[PDB]
Symmetry: C3
Subunit: 208 residues, 3 copies
């Protein structure tokens, strides 16, 4: 088995010309991670073993600076353009004035075995916990998805957290999530994780 783990996407009815990932020179992509297609990876990002970032259906997939995509995390997205050239707007997320299938902001941690599936956006300085799930949702900035929480079809307001195990599928429930406060157990977590993963990215780059 001989292959390149950083690859162009395939030609399909919705993808006339292949794109290959645009990765900042200071990002570290593990040899056992997979990054395919129309992807932009920012500076000082670490992509760990067994992650799969695949921008071949819905595109583009963006990962902002100093973010981390941990072991086994999957990024993928629903088709953004149909077989007619029509952009399927329900499957497209808008962040600032740019369109994405999946937008991962800056300083965001996607912890081990989580998944963010487009259409989706994750705001700056948010922690997506281990085994958590985000799909058809916009997670605000400075949020915390504790381990095994999920956001499906909702907008999670800035500065809120989703308790471990909780699956949020209605906007009514998302609106009443609890707020991150100083004494909250995950209140400083993301900053510490980002500091660690920026340092891991540089250490691993020095072995590459």
């Amino acid at each position: 088995d001989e292959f390149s783990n950083i690859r162009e996407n395939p030609v399909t009815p919705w993808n006339p010309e292949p794109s290959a990932p645009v990765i900042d020179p200071t990002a570290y992509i593990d040899p056992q991670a997979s990054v395919i297609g129309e992807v932009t990876i920012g500076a000082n990002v670490m992509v760990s073993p067994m992650a799969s970032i695949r921008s071949d259906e819905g595109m583009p997939i963006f990962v902002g600076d100093r973010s981390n995509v941990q072991d086994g995390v999957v990024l993928h997205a629903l088709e953004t353009i149909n077989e007619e050239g029509e952009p399927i707007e329900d499957n497209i997320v808008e962040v600032d004035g740019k369109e994405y299938a999946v937008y991962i902001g800056n300083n965001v941690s996607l912890a081990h075995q989580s998944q963010v599936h487009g259409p989706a956006a994750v705001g700056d300085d948010t922690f997506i916990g281990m085994q958590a799930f985000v799909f058809k949702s916009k997670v605000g900035n400075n949020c915390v998805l504790e381990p095994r929480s999920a956001a499906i079809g909702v907008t999670i307001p800035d500065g809120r957290y989703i308790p471990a195990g909780m699956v949020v599928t209605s906007q009514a429930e998302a609106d009443k999530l609890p707020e991150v406060t100083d004494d909250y157990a995950y209140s400083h977590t993301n900053e510490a994780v980002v500091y660690v993963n920026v340092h891991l990215a540089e250490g691993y780059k020095e072995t590459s």
Copy 2:
């Protein structure tokens, strides 16, 4: 690290002679997927990065035509024959008149990070959602397991769906699951997913 990702299973007390996978020429197995042992993969199937199909304990594992095994999905199964040559019938699923450890039907989608663990059967045209789980169960045809749902020890009747996050462990609960209807949010999903993944399989085969 030099290896073949499509491999025979190992000799064990329950597996006197190794078998290697039987894969249709039109299926695409990603270089970073793993397919081991007594496996049959049908036409136009796509197996994505980080999937692991391992037919070394319970066997055989079958994946029908135009189905997809998405990133990080695991197929494995409990031992089907003991150290005595006796077939452990509780761990064997019957589909038509053929015996399998895991049977994935035709046009079935196993979405990212899901797992189907034998004994198990998944009927045609069913969607197994992201991070969902099927074990010791028979999922009927035209079903939908929404993201993070699970079927354990049960038979899910044809045309029903399991709401996101719901873990179904009793036949009484499986019998009362809701039915897929036209206005249900996942009612056309599988057909669209299968169309996309058949096209991805061909596009990726043209890069191989």
Copy 3:
């Protein structure tokens, strides 16, 4: 993509000198598994495709004899020493009189897609079920975490089980978990799994 899947950890502010894994000659590490850093793997252990054992943040990570780390399982841990040389004792687990970030005991099964994230300890002869999660917890010996259960911030007493889907986050709830008894469905499971995986480790070693 050319790489070694068994690697030293990177130099960081908390890791002045790299360590490479210490793996018993009778253990089998799949070519598509990843094992990085200050890790000790015992005899007759099987590490399956797509597992990631990464001892680069919190360390060391230990896996005892005749245990198994199944497909897609992730072991990782919170930082154990800060940028000051101070050992962060809350993130360190004590087992006997030795300190670990993650301690997996002997005869323990980490089933497919589970994760044990340090600080954490898992006692001998315990089964951690498919897609289950252990973090900031001490799981006793002879326990069973059924599929999709989770232990977060708690001590699970010896001989207890966590029902499928249940997320246990309080010591009050952990104290009242049910006990494994002869008639419990998973009462003999781990011993059978360990017997199978010890045999798989040897079979796979004979293909290596």
